[PDB]
């Protein structure tokens, strides 16, 4: 009918594929999770 469309698209390219592109990077989250932990 058409509602699931607004999140089924946001699950793949906007999430799962941008989720590849975060350990495709890794790097900076070593210090971002220490600005977050010691910032906490």
């Amino acid at each position: 009918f058409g509602w699931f469309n607004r999140m089924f698209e946001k699950s793949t390219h906007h999430y799962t594929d941008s989720v590849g592109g975060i350990l495709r990077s890794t790097g900076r989250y070593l210090v971002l999770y220490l600005i977050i932990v010691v910032g906490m």
Binding site: S11, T12, Y15, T16, V19, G20, L23
Partner: protein, 50 residues
């Protein structure tokens, strides 16, 4: 291990067919825990901080 491996391609195949829960479960919260934060404050000033 017991299923077909994925050093990087099983951590994605898994986090694709059941995100629904971790989005609707950690959401059945949020607003079920919000009648504590606001909508009250009269009879209980403790529901606020809880």
């Amino acid at each position: 291990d017991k299923e077909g491996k994925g050093l990087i391609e099983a951590t994605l195949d898994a986090v694709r067919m059941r995100l629904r829960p971790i989005l609707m479960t950690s959401l059945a919260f949020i607003l079920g825990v919000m009648p504590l934060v606001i909508s009250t404050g009269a009879g209980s000033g403790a529901q606020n901080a809880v």
